[PDB]
Amino acid sequence: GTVNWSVEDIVKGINSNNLESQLQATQAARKLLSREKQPPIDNIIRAGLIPKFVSFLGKTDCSPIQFESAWALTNIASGTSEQTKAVVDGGAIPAFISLLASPHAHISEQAVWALGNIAGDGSAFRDLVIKHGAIDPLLALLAVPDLSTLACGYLRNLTWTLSNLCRNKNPAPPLDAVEQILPTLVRLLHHNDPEVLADSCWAISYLTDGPNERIEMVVKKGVVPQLVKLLGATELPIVTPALRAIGNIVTGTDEQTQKVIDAGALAVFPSLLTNPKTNIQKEATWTMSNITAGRQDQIQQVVNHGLVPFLVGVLSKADFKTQKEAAWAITNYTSGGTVEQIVYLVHCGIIEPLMNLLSAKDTKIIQVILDAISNIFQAAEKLGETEKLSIMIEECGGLDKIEALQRHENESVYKASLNLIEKYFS
């Protein structure tokens, strides 16, 4: 029937003055466009079919051609930016928004999907979709007493599309749009479907990826406890964005960071910092590094939750990028910590693995580690214990590495090392 049509035959059917011939040809186009191997998107665009598809979106008396055209355009918009632009340039945005209110659930859903692809292209198209008034009708589709009454695929698509309206920066989405969307997002974040939860977490991770003011908008909605709960989920597609969101939040103020701690986030970290998925371990360690950049009472919570041994662990053995985040966690800890907290660090065995990493080629991690060592020595100075530390560092081959770093070509490195040598190793 409509399987494997040539583009010329599709054009012929669409240019016929016959609505049923146009429907068949549009369906043929939809099938070409939904084939996994190189759908001929550019050939379809070149044939000038987008404006025709867009006009078909308005055919209220022929819902089948609305659906087929909506599907065809969705798949063109799913392509490159240039391909998405062709769809927008054809006037698709207002046409799809009008379709959100369709009495046909499958058509409304397709329009949600298409708008998701358009918004997903970038900040400009996202903002243009918002300007055409998409948010109101989208939110209206979710204005039900219990989300569980909605078709699963339908809910997932709405969640995903809303996440794209939250996505991207330079600029971030309009403050008013974010305020408008958040209460619905908070609701979706409490739903029970893993895909809805994952995409709700993605949206929250985008919204918290910015200045403290953007973080505050989210934190004020009280979602942190739910994020921490999702941090403990078994589904990796949920934990990944949940953890990015939590990590973003702790890049904010000390107070915003405290809400994460208050919600019990630290108790999940023994598992996160030993997680078999490398990226989870890395993001969790990054997150830890920002928490140890906090107040002394927050560093103390890290101590109380027994997380210093886990940091020693990651520093001792982990993917290198993870070890780098650990190094940062330690330097931040030593920067803001009390003498007793810093001493505890040494007692947990931080020195040897810290020394071992000085063989790294990465210039920045070397600077970070040397800073930590300087900080630790400072604490020791205030206890008259520099000698015993000097010996510790020498016993594990640390002094050898620091001595060599005087020959390091980077200025700040061969400076910092010289300073340590001439001040504690004479």
Binding site: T74, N117, G120, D121, W160, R167, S205, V250, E283, T292
Partner: peptide, 21 residues
């Protein structure tokens, strides 16, 4: 003297989706 650091890498869900059926 500890400064907070934003993520080094972009992390996001799928920006666009093709409908297969």
């Amino acid at each position: 003297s500890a400064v907070k650091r934003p993520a080094a890498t972009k992390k996001a869900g799928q920006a666009k989706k093709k409908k297969l059926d």
